[PDB]
Design a protein around this nucleic acid. Structure first.
Lengths: 799, 793
DNA sequence: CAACGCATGAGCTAGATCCG
DNA sequence: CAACGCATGAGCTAGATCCG
């Protein structure tokens, strides 16, 4: 048979030898086998227990900290292959920290699928270099066998097999003193083999019974099916654990087995691509009866079944497990008994939920003010009810002033009853709005939600406020609204002006951020206005804002204020929030204008957009200047030590880019470059200060050397005079002429003619010239460097 | 008379010319006089206004943005001198931003006391450089007269007095075209002077009527008394504002006027050293009857009289008003309607209050913790009562759990009634302690303080928890305590562990109130252990803490936990806090190794204490070894282009002297604790140093002799420095002839080694001077003697 | 009679219908 | 029968009376 035994789930063994007895009949093991951490175990109870039927290993096998073993071959006589379906601690097979292990005994290993072997901290093992991992491990670059007994060549290493020469040495490879590592001809690399060199069927491995048969060898490569295995079985069966394929009726049962939330190590197995895979990946969702994965058109809920049917949420961790959940098949209860700052984290943890079936209850919430973090809520089933058929419950909460924004929020209630008691910080009109937007309209308990204990302490207002005039400037805004007086003008404390900038318009209403939290609405107060007893007067109260960032939208509103007393009147008034943007002004300076020269007429400059554009800048303004040379260098004796070597004004309206190149200019000339970032131009033309950089273009190759008639005049005193022409456009400037002469058989003797010397003499001279035939050559050395040499002018002076 | 007119309080004028009429009769003005910002003013309304009877100015006079004036002389004819007791904006006089001022006109001004004068932004002013400020200003450097009409010399400057030569020029000094600056002989500097050069009485200034009379000149220097004045007034009177003396009968009346606290311009004047001073300074305190200031033995209360009897505090600002107050003569009510973090600021704001007279009311307090910020309260007088003769009021505070630690807190109550209603988190035993420590014992109302609305929600515990075994390490601490069970050992949720370090033992107790505090007792939870049903078992639950720094005292206690229910049992139990210190470990590396050479042998070392002490370091340990230099420079031609130690103890600096001179040393130091048991010492810090490159040993002294060959190539023989500054690398050998300079040569290390000297090829016959200098790698040394040798032609 | 002038514009002198 | 041995000490294998 290929596999006549039984499947065998991965076990864990520790502190005893009692629970290894379950290995009596299983032959192939799925998962991993792990035995570890046993101390009070004598070595003698090991010579009687064994398991001959074990061959296949899926993930890994590990033994660690064992006291009593000396050669495990008596325990594992027949295992041959490990699939390595899950790598263990980036390793495939490891033995570590052994005490009595005399020898390994793993003589049946044929081919390691994936991963590496590691042997460490074992001072009792030998024959470690006689394994030939390369013939079993397809990868050797990951092996790690250091600090063992074979650290010193001291353990024998004698064994009676081909003794391969894989390295530069004739090395003998044996497992034990009674066994070597079997190697047959390599005509087939991993197609299985026999002891006579005959390769068995192509699609199986290792030990074999009859060649060229996929029905009677031991282990085959791809899959397995009832004594046979083909590379891809037909779709009466669907692949499983990448070593089998089976009918859907088998693994439809496993999904049902632990659909009961009893053991969280399983998987609700799903069919996809002929695989009964644990989970179909993202962008795919489960179907009800077909057990396939639907392409998940758009976002798909990833339903999140609640345990126990009910749950309470009190801290970050209590809700952290709900992150990503969208639909709840139970009931939820919230109670933040105190807490510092959770309003900034609920959206990051639960602000993506939409559907729930149970009932929602809020109680004893201390620092809660709104329900905005419940973002995508639309419907509650209310399938289960609180005692008294209550679907929504609110009780004993001392800061709740709002629930939702019905201008852009929708919520539906299937059934149940609401409970609003001891909630003194929320007005009755808001819960009337709750009822109107909800499904219930007249389902009142009588006594229904409390109408007297809720909102009594909070003076909910019913009066609006409107502006009178708005003013704009670059930094300062002015406000002044229509004046107000309470029924008792004596009873009045003034107004508060809450504000903050906003790049959008999805700004929250006053959420009453009173406990710990993020940036609230920074605010100043205003003195109450002076009574005038006049219909027409300056009773319109205003206030100034000064420190503003220009060109920025800003949202503001004003709120009244009054004392608290026995009478339930003078609730004050509240304006409405609007949006107003500030004006723009001069922009900031551009950033890092980088100019680079490549050719003698090409100069490119690139910069960065200004840090503060202050509105949509229209274009960039550019300017340059052709710099001049140093006039003081004209009068330097350069043959003395010390020489130098360097490296309106028209404009354009450069638009819609970040760099510009300029051509048609002088060669090897310095240039001062300035550029202004600038906002909208034709009205109030205002630009920033120009960023100033300097740049010099490349020189011209021929500009340094001069060609022309080099004539000579001979004087009576053997002082020959020399006439020639200077470069018209030197690279920067000519600084010296490398004048020199050569008689035949004599080296290049060079003299100097400085700039001023050449200017005054219109040439040079050679005092004290020996009679002979001399060749005079000149190199026009400009400041850009040495030029080329002239023609060596021949002239012979006789005795 | 001397000062026949009237005293005249400092006055402020704006928006009109109306409020100047109050100065009809006053001649001497105290304080300052500010007139500014009038625009709807014709220039013609000033020619008919004057005050000819003004003499004295205390602080300063300021003209600012006046429209219509052109010459102040029509208004101020007799101003002479100013005391300048307070410098306005660090100046004595400033006229600024005038529009029509044509000529200045201050001609009667004689002497300034202190400060300087500044004129700015006035393009209508002339004769400005014709003043001679130095003869009125005792200081001139800080003058600032810039950007005026005299920015350009264009306004004429014709003017009819000496025209002094104070500068390098004969400059005329004159005020107007009708009057010039008046200067008399300086036989007396400012002792009063007439127009005939007759100096008046020594103790007066300015203009004067008859010479040498302390009774009929105009203004005097120090003080004033009834038409006379002496430099030190007799003590029937007390000096006031450093320009008069007067008896206490006057300034006590002003003290009694201000004790009616109606204006905030007060200075509650007290008598001290014949000066009825505003306030006798720190280290002093006034006495009631005698009006003197008591030496203030110890911290004296500086009583803070509360206004309008009562006050409420809700934010940081309302409390900052009473910062620095200790005794309050009223009643206070506190309502913290929320807030974020306030417990850490009440100490810094009001932690100096100890006594209160009225009553205390607390209501609607939300985010409170305790009243520990009331550090030193010991008595309430209760001289004002709440309705129903109530003195202490606590109501509708849904968070309060503790008031004071009465083991170390002393507090008594004089009279009144206490109130406790609707405070569901504070147990009644604390109120029992309040009653027992307070003055009252049974003064109850019936209904008195509510016994059901308070502490019902929070289960106050009545059981203690005791530790069983403690083990400590350098890094970790293990704890395990006695077993415990509720009457129903099902209802239970485990325990909490609150711990934190504390360098002292004045640690705040856990309070159970929600403070939005940056620091709180970091706490972990514990899983309740296994029920064993056996009295002798492993039921003792424990826990390990490991993330701790060595050698640090740590506070710890454990708290029970159980679900809330309807039955009023299973309150739990609470351990008492204790203190435990972790063990010590190896120290850290020392810091800042500094070595300096002050001789060729002395090497002074200085270091810094290490960052991590890990306990009191018992001593140090320093090791030094003999190190040296390299040898790759030996072949480079330079004409081209155990180790001894000592247990240093209880000091921060060290010197290694009495050792071989000019030797390189690598020295290392370690600091650590006790040695013979558990020999623990940290790592060392290495230093590298050289003694100073010497000045005489690098140079070599010896006979620089020469051997003459027949080919005019004279050999040179001398000796190398036996101990040079490291390694001699180049000898600055040179030869100098008569009429010739010190012509030089060079020799490398190997050349001198192979030749045992040098030579000179192609030498002119003459008396040469051969001088050599040692130029090693560390620098040049001294020259040898210039040797004389006279080879003939 | 509906911005600017006869200031400055947030550095011990007021604080943008604050002025007419 | 009251620290150590037949581990390590917070890097997918337990979590310091955790094993005796």
């Amino acid at each position: 048979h290929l596999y006549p035994g039984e499947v065998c789930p991965g076990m864990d063994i520790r502190n005893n030898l009692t629970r290894l007895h379950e290995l009596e009949n299983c032959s192939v093991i799925e998962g991993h086998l792990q035995i570890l951490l046993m101390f009070k175990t004598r070595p003698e109870d090991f010579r009687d227990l064994s398991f001959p039927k074990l061959i296949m290993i899926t993930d890994y096998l590990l033994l660690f900290r064992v006291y009593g073993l000396e050669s495990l071959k008596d325990l594992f006589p027949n295992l041959t292959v490990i699939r390595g379906s899950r790598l263990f601690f980036n390793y495939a097979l490891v033995i570590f920290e052994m005490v009595h292990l005399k020898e390994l005994g793993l003589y049946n290993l044929m081919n390691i699928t994936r991963g590496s072997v590691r042997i460490e901290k074992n001072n009792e093992l030998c024959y470690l270099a006689t394994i030939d991992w390369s013939r079993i491990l397809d990868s050797v670059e990951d092996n790690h066998i250091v600090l063992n007994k074979d650290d010193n060549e001291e353990c024998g290493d004698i064994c009676p097999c081909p003794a391969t020469v894989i390295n530069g040495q004739f090395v003998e490879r044996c497992w034990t003193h009674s066994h070597c590592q079997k190697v047959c001809p390599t005509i087939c690399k991993s197609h299985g083999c026999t002891a006579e060199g005959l390769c068995c069927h192509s699609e199986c491995l290792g030990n074999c019974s009859q060649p060229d048969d996929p029905t009677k060898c031991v282990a085959c490569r791809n899959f397995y099916l009832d004594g046979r295995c083909v590379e891809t079985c037909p779709p009466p069966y669907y692949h499983f654990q990448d070593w089998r394929c089976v009918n859907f009726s088998f693994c439809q049962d496993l999904h049902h087995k632990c659909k009961n939330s009893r053991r969280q190590g399983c998987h609700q197995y799903v069919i996809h691509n002929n695989k009964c895979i644990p989970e179909c990946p993202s962008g795919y969702t489960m179907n009800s009866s077909n057990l396939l994965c639907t392409p998940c058109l758009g976002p798909c809920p990833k339903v999140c079944h609640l345990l126990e049917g009910e749950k309470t949420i009190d801290s970050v961790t209590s809700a952290q497990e709900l992150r990503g959940c969208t639909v709840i098949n139970g009931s939820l209860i919230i109670n933040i008994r105190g807490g510092n700052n959770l309003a900034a984290e609920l959206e990051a943890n639960l602000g993506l939920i939409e559907e729930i079936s149970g009932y929602l209850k809020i109680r004893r919430s201390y620092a809660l003010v709104s329900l905005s973090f419940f973002r995508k809520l639309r419907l509650i089933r209310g399938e289960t009810l609180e005692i008294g058929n209550y679907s929504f419950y609110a009780l004993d909460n001392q800061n709740l002033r709002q629930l939702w924004d019905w201008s852009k929020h929708n919520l539906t209630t299937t059934q149940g009853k609401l409970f609003f008691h001891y909630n003194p910080k929320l007005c009755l009109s808001e819960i009337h709005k709750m009822e109107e937007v909800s499904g219930t309209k007249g389902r009142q308990e009588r006594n229904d939600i409390a109408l007297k204990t809720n909102g009594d302490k909070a003076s909910c207002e019913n009066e609006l406020l409107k502006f009178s005039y708005i003013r704009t400037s670059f930094d300062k805004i002015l406000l002044r609204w229509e004046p107000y007086w309470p029924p008792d003008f004596r009873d009045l404390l003034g107004f508060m002006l809450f504000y903050k900038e906003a790049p959008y318009q999805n700004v929250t209403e006053f959420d009453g951020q009173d406990a710990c939290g993020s940036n609230s609405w920074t605010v100043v107060d205003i003195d109450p206005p002076l009574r005038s007893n006049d219909p027409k007067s300056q009773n319109h109260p205003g206030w100034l804002m000064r420190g503003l960032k220009p060109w920025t939208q800003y949202a503001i509103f004003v709120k009244t204020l009054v004392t608290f007393s026995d009478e339930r009147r003078t609730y004050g008034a509240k304006s409405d929030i609007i949006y107003v943007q500030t004006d723009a002004t001069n922009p900031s300076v551009p950033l890092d204008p980088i100019s680079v020269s490549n050719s003698s007429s090409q100069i490119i400059l690139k910069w960065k957009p200004p840090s503060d554009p202050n509105g949509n800048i229209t274009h960039y303004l550019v300017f340059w200047e052709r710099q001049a040379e140093d006039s003081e260098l004209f009068e330097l004796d350069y043959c003395l030590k010390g020489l130098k070597l360097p490296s309106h004004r028209p404009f354009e309206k450069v638009v819609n880019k970040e760099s510009l190149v300029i051509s048609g200019l002088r060669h090897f000339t310095g240039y001062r470059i300035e550029l202004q970032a600038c906002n909208q131009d034709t009205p109030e033309e205002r630009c920033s200060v120009a960023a100033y950089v300097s740049a010099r273009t490349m020189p011209e190759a021929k500009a340094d050397d001069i060609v022309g008639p080099v004539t000579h005049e001979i004087f009576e005193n053997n002082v020959v005079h020399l006439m020639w022409q200077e470069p018209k456009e030197p690279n920067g400037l000519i600084v010296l002429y490398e004048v020199s002469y050569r008689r035949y058989g004599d080296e290049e003797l060079h003299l100097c003619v400085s700039r001023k010397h050449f200017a005054l003499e219109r040439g040079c001279r050679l005092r004290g010239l020996s009679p002979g035939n001399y060749s005079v050559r000149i190199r026009a050395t400009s400041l850009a460097g040495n030029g080329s040499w002239t023609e060596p002018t021949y002239f012979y002076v006789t005795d």
